[PDB]
Structures are given as C-alpha cells and as structure tokens.
C-alpha cells in the first residue's frame, strides 16, 4: 500500500532517476548546487540584516516623551476649543488623535463637540478642507 515508514519513493520521482544512465547524478547535482546557491544568499541577507541592525542601535530611548497622565473634563475652555478646531483641520476624523491632542477630552465628547459646534465653527468647511489633502 505505502512504502516503509520513512522510505520515500514517489511514482514520478522514479521515472526521473531512471530517464538515462546518469539522470542519477544529474538530479543529485542540481540540488547540490541549488542548495549552496541558497546557503550562500543567506550570508548576503544576514549581512544586509547585520548592518541594518547596527543602525538601529540606541533604540529610540533619547527620543521618548514622558507620561501625560490627566483627567477628563466637561468644560470646553475657549483654549480647548481652539486646539480642537486646528486638530480637525490637520486630522480630519481621527477622533483618537484629536482626543490625544487636546489632552483632556474623551474620544466621544469630541464626537459630540463635532455636532454641537458644527453650528459655529463651520466644521463642514474645516473638514472638507482637510479632504483637499
């Protein structure tokens, strides 16, 4: 039914190693080559990868910006609103960013803002102007 456990012999394979007197050593040589031609282009992408690793040396530690631990407010200081407007202009709809910028407003008070002040900030215009980019 099946070859011994671990013995390998496909139909098609056999016809290949019998095809002439040295289809034998032909096939076994193509792989001997075909292999080194991989085994070698490892080095290459290992050395490529090796220099790129050294450029990333130093992580991003010098560039890390401390923790902004601060609480949500209900009040929209006229300051806060203005930060908001420009956040929209430069961010469109990423309510998460917009939230992160103003610093003390939840991802939704934001959404709500969008509707309340839509009124008097022409948030329409503002937004369509962000779409031009």
């Amino acid at each position: 039914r099946k070859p011994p456990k671990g013995m390998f012999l496909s139909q098609e394979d056999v016809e290949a190693v019998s095809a002439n007197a040295t289809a034998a050593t032909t096939v076994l040589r193509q792989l001997d080559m075909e292999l080194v031609s991989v085994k070698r282009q490892i080095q290459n992408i290992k050395q490529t990868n090796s220099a790129l690793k050294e450029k990333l040396d130093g992580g991003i530690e010098p560039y890390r910006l401390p923790e902004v631990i601060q609480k949500c407010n209900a009040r929209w200081t006229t300051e806060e609103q203005l930060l908001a407007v420009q956040a929209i202009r430069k961010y469109g709809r990423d309510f998460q960013a917009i939230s992160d910028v103003i610093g003390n407003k939840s991802v939704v008070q934001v959404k709500n803002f969008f509707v309340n002040y839509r009124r008097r900030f022409n948030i329409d215009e503002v937004l369509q102007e962000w779409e031009a980019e």
Partner: protein, 666 residues
Amino acid sequence: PSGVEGAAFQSRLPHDRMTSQEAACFPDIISGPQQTQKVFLFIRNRTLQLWLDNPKIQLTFEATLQQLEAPYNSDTVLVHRVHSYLERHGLINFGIYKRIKPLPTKKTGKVIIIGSGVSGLAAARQLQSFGMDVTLLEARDRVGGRVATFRKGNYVADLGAMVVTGLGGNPMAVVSKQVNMELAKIKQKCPLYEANGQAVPKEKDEMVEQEFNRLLEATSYLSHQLDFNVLNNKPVSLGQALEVVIQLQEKHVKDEQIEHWKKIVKTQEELKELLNKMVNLKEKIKELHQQYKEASEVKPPRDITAEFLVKSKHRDLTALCKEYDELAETQGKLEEKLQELEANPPSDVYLSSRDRQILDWHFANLEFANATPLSTLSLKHWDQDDDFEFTGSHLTVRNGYSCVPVALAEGLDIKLNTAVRQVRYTASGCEVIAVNTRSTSQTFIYKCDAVLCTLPLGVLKQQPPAVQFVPPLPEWKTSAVQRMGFGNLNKVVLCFDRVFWDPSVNLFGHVGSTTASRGELFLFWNLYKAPILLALVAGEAAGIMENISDDVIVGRCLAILKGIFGSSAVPQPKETVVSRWRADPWARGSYSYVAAGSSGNDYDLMAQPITPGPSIPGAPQPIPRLFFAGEHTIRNYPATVHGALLSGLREAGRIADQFLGAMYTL
C-alpha cells in the same frame, strides 16, 4: 502444529485440502462427496503420522490398516489406494529404512542415472526400492556431488552444503533421524568488524541492518505497487532497484535541506523588510523630536496655533513611538523563530561513508544467500520461494554433511570415475556413452529404458556442451537452460592447533573496504568440534578469487583475523583448503538463482521430461524417455539439499508410474 495434523504440515501438505497432485490420482474422491474427502484426508494424515513417528522401518499396507480405526479402516480399497500413492511419491518409506519384505527376487525395467549427488541417490534408492534395475554414473571418485566434506585427522569441514534450514517440514528432518548426523544450531548473533579490525557499536550495527531491511521492502514496493519491472527493455534486477531506492533516499535527504534553509530565507527576509521599516522610522522619529524640541523653545505665553503645534507634534511622536514599539515586538519573535530553525537542521547525510560500507556487508550476506551479484537476480522473482520457508532454526552438520550421501549410496550400483559424454534416447530406449576419467579413451555403453539426468545446471549450460544430447534438446528446454541463473560461492577452511575466537560465537563477519570487494572473505564460521574456521567468498568476489593462488587467499585471511584478534593470537594454519566451484568441471558453479528475466516457471520447464520422436513414421506416440531431477528442477525449494532430495523423489515416482504402471488410480 501436532497430532495427525502435524504430519500433513511436516510433509508439506494442507491438512484439510487435497492437493492437485492428489486430485490427479483420486478424481473419484475429490469430485465426489465432502464426507468421503474427510475420510481420505484423515487416512493420508494418519498414515503420514505413522511413518513419521517411526521412520527407521518400512511401513507396509498391513501395519497401517492395523492401527487405523473404524469408520476409516472400513474401506480397505481406499486405505490401499492411499498407502500406495504415498509410497510411490516418497512421502513414506524414503531414505534409509529397514525393509520388512526384502527386495523382489527379479527386477523390472532398466534406468541409468547421471550423477550421484543427493537428487541422484535419492531417486536411485526409490527406484531400487520399487524393484528396478538402477545404475548410477558418477564423474567423480566420491558420491554426493555438491555435498563435499573435508576429512583429515579430526579436522572435518564441508566445502559443499553446510546448513540445514530448520526442521519444520523439512524432509531432512527424517533423514536426520535415519542417519547419525550431529545437528547443532546456529546462534544468530553475528558481530561485525570494520576494515580496521574493531567492532561495530550496537549503535550502528542495529541502525544499518534495520535500514537494510527497510531498503529491501522498498524494492518490493517498487516491484508490486509501482510496477517498476522493465527498463529499456531489459528486466530490472534487484541491484538496479536497490540503487534506484538508495538514490531516491539521497534525493529526498537533499530535497529536505533545500526546503528547510529555503524556509530560513523566507524568514530571514521578512526580517530584512522589517528592519528597513524600522530604520526609516527611527528616521522620522529622529527629525520629529527635532521639530518638537524647536517648537518647545518658543517660550510661553504663546498664541494658540503655536501652542497647538507643540501639542500636535507631541502626539505625532508618541504615536510614531507606539508604532516602532510594536515593531521591536515583532522583531524579537522572528529573531528566535530563527535559532528555532537553526537548531533543527535535518540530517546532513542519508548514509555516511562508514555506514554505506557496512550496508555493503549486508548486501554481501544477500550475495551469499543467492550465490550471485544482486545485479543479476530478478527483482520480480528473486524470492518467490520465501513462501515455502521451513520453520525452526537453522543448523549445521557437526560431523560433515557427506555422512548423508554416503549413507544413501549404500547398497547401490554406482560407477565412480565415469563421465557421461553423450545421451541418446529413442522411441525404444536409450543408450548412454560415458568414459573413464583416468584414461579417457577407455569407453562405456549403457543401454536402458530411461535416463534420469541429475547434471548440474552449470554443466547443462556449458558451451560448448560437455554432454551431448541425441537428438538435441528441444528449443523450449535449452531456452530455460539459458534463461535460468547458475551462481557461485566459495569456502576457505582454516585449521589450527588452538581456539582463539569467541567459543560461544558461531559466526562473525568482516567489513571489506569497497563495494567492489564486499564479498571477499566477508564472514567466518566456527562450526566444528575441532579448531576450524570457515571463510565465505561470495558475490562479485567469488568469481575473481578462483583466479588467485591458495596462499595469497590464506594470506588475506590471517591478515583479516589478526586485525580482529591481535597479531599473535593467530598461529600459522596447520591445514588449509579452498573451493573453486565455478572451476570444478562437474559443477561449473554453486547453485541456481532466479536470474533477471527468468521465473519460478522456468524451474518447471526444467523438470518436464523428454519424449522422443517416433522411429517408423506413423507409429504410435512413445513413452517419454529422458527425465530430469536436481536442485535446479524444483520450483519451490531451489538450490538446496532438501530441494534436490525432493526432486529425486519426484522423478522416481514419475518414472515408476511410467514403467511399472500406477495400479492405485483405479
């Protein structure tokens, strides 16, 4: 098995079915009612048992009926018909029994028998037992043919057959009781000793053997399941097919490395793409910090766009830092899924150079078994007899196998030194012309009714012919003589003053350096009561060694043995013998084998007797005159002593039926 059913098995017959051979003679019974068949079978089996339990005395019809019971011993024409059938075909009272009724005063018909090898003797005994005039012509000055035994002082060693292959159903089982032969078993444990002369570790020894067995079945799969049996018109040999498998196992080894390291690069090259994304991020991140720092220099108080700016860039940066962190994450994962892959390379090799050498000793073992280069054995058939294998363990004859022929030979008309040169057989009889081997011109003519030819296949193969047939052998017979394989194997007998090997070790092997020389002195036997060692020369080697002086060979022998046992535990041999069977003119080799392009069916062809033309044309079709027996004639037990013996019995049955008539079929 045992009981009455032991007999049927011990006699090589199905205890609950009638054979084709029986059908032939009892077509009334086998075509008839089931009830009767059972009676018959029993009678057969019972008789068998009776013969078997006591094979040192003839078993008569009367003595039988006696121990038989009712209902069975009710019908005596059966019991007679059956006892007879059995007797005729040497199933009972064969070999060396004591006669109750001494031999029929006057004889009937005359038979010449070429060769007094076992097949020869066995058939002779039968025929004489059946009251015929029987004479044997033997080219040699001793009986036994390919059953040589060397004797000198207490040195005693076979150069011929040597092993009995287990008694479970083996006719020799009976002979063994009939004749004083000392039967010692073969302890299957065989240590190997590489070219250097040091043991092969239980490690390898086991892995290689087991790889060997795996490789065999492997071919067997190619044969049956893939039908790989012809190639470029030639029949495919076992050797070929073992190469094609080993190759494919080498191929697959590589195929695996390839797609293992190929899995490395596909990873190693995700790691490339990732790093590039990482560097080009520490890129903007660098220059973004810049911009934030610069816009945090604008000191308060500041207007709102300039405030937003700070606040803006701040986000954009912790944002880009989340990103780059989730990447250092990823990075570390790949970096390990890479020692992972570097930790488990698949095997470097299919077989090492030391491995593939040991595998060769296992191939030499096979070369020995079949007496031939596996490049010659038919893949499809090489082992067709492996079905009919005896049970129990193999033995050796401690007191020299020759003891058997000589025993059989006893009481028989035998012309030693008589070389048959021409066989002539005609409608009304045959004549056999032999010469004397000492002065060759001194000539002999034998006239008989039938010739039974036990000539080795080697001999039958000789070109140009050593024996000549008149008229020549039919094209269907000669074709079978060519198609069939007659192989070779040689022995070296080493005789010392002292045991220096392991006394509890029957056989130990040596591992030659090359494929080429795998068979050369590849195995040794401590078998005997004296200090004698036996060295096999098999496979490709055997043929080539015949061309080398005794000394040289015995040289290579000691050489090897010192290597294994220390350069001064090994004395000079007192007495040394060396076979050369392919050389020997009355053998021309060792024993047959199923060559590529032959089959089991060619063996049948060998046994088919020859019927001459008619003399006066438009006369009736003759009786057949020329018959064949011998190792090469017996489909199911080729190349063996027991196989020969068996064929001898067979032809006797057949000849007797022919010339004395078969009364028992009515």
